[PDB]
């Protein structure tokens with residue numbers, strides 16, 4: 001069993017305890033840690049933050065304690081225009097240029113693999129995404145010849161039916177990529193005038209419009225398209241999506257007036273770190289879509305949908321029952337890394353819950 005855990009650069013700058021550095025990551029927790037988002041310039045892979053070489057160093061040092069740990073550098077991200085990927089990958093020149101520039105980067109900085117987080121390729125991009133993957137992987141193979149362990153190659157794919165169907169040639173890309181991460185947590189957003197859970201497990205028998213919008217449908221679908229279960233890792237979010245209620249209505253379908261108030265620490269509308277949610281929860285009312293196996297809280301005109309240890313283990317068993325490669329947790333920085341916000345004196349409570357399940361048979 002795998003546990004792929006992301007670490008995002010921008011989390012350092014958070015204030016108070018919110019600040020987080022690779023420095024605080026428990027070396028034996030996950031099996032794969034992914035530094036989140038490297039840039040691309042002059043078609044070459046490149047750093048982002050002014051101090052990644054430093055933080056790079058600091059994350060890769062964790063392997064001094066856990067030899068089995070592996071680390072990968074992600075490329076792309078949400079604040080990286082999809083166009084920029086498309087532009088690179090449509091002109092063979094740019095593509096190959098980009099590619100031949102990656103292995104040395106990783107070798108130079110201690111990484112064991114590259115991660116492709118091209119956030120949503122288009123209709124016009126499928127044919128080239130297949131290329132990037134192919135060639136990129138061919139290069140990683142030709143470099144093992146130099147007598148070093150072969151660099152890993154993975155990709156974060158959307159879990160949206162349309163999304164996948166629009167820009168993913170799963171069948172192909174699945175046989176090249178060492179593993180595929182399914183972003184099973186973006187099935188809703190403030191862009192929908194009404195309340196909704198973003199990382200539901202099941203379709204839930206009362207609504208029937210977006211059944212394709214749940215981890216189960218996603219998985220079962222990816223399998224159909226051809227991807228094997230030994231390359232699949234299900235995403236598990238460690239944050240929550242919050243809304244500001246446009247009425248006293250709180251039950252399913254209550255109208256939304258817009259995203260939620262920012263977090264003390266995560267400082268950003270619509271989203272909330274687990275540890276922030278832990279504080280929120282106090283004085284809040286907690287419910288749970290028993291149908292879709294996930295909770296939601298409300299306090300005032302603030303409606304929040306999130307994942308708790310329960311819902312998370314729940315999902316964890318799910319992937320075990322479909323025989324998947326492993327689990328993926330989006331944002332360690334978002335978990336209670338210090339373990340002081342969420343009652344129990346446990347560090348990384350959520351990511352642990354999943355580990356403890358996966359550590360089971």
Ligand SMILES: *[C@@H]1O[C@H](CO)[C@@H](O[C@H]2O[C@H](CO)[C@@H](O[C@@H]3O[C@H](CO)[C@@H](O)[C@H](O[C@@H]4O[C@H](CO)[C@@H](O[C@@H]5O[C@H](CO)[C@@H](O)[C@H](O)[C@@H]5O)[C@H](O)[C@@H]4O)[C@@H]3O)[C@H](O)[C@H]2NC(C)=O)[C@H](O)[C@H]1NC(C)=O
Nearest residue numbers: 038039040041042043046047048049050051079080081084
């Ligand atoms: C991820 O990558 C991003 C793109 O590479 C990068 O953001 C950008 O990168 C550069 C800026 O560093 C940006 O370039 C310009 O934007 C300006 C307009 O707003 C233009 O004026 C500028 O045009 C020129 O480019 C020349 C250099 O590229 C510059 O010539 C010299 O450059 C030297 C210093 O830059 C200087 O020493 C020398 O004397 C030259 O003068 C020339 O003068 C002129 O100004 C660029 O178009 C990229 O376009 C922008 N990327 C895009 C496409 O949006 C991010 O920094 C990176 N992320 C992180 C955090 O690192």
